[PDB]
Amino acid sequence: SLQDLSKQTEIPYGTVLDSAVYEHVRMKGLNPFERDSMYSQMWRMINRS
């Protein structure tokens, strides 16, 4: 499932930049309203450099 995969730490993960997937996860990341730590952890895995 997405929850463990987003909350494990051994496997790095990401996508193609400038994709709708990237833009969607960035939208869920940058927004301070967004609730589940899922989205912040996904962004923090992405936002490495």
Place this chain on the structure above:
Amino acid sequence: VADRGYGIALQHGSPYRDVFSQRILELQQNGDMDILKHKWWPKNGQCDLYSSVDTKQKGGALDIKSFAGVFCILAAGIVLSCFIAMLETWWNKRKGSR
């Protein structure tokens, strides 16, 4: 487990209570409250506040720290054997034969 809320408290019979509650509700609707909220709890902190995955032992290996207490069992024997051996010089003064 939220339910309760933080509030501003007044003396009984203060008329201003209603004005305060009105203006607070207006600020909540008008979005200004969200700006002051974000200002002091900015999302993009130094580190993840929530992950405890945070593990030290991974390789499962024994090492010169975890095992090393056993070496004091050897050291006790070394010391005691040294101490006992030196009693040659104590007894052989008058042992009757060496």
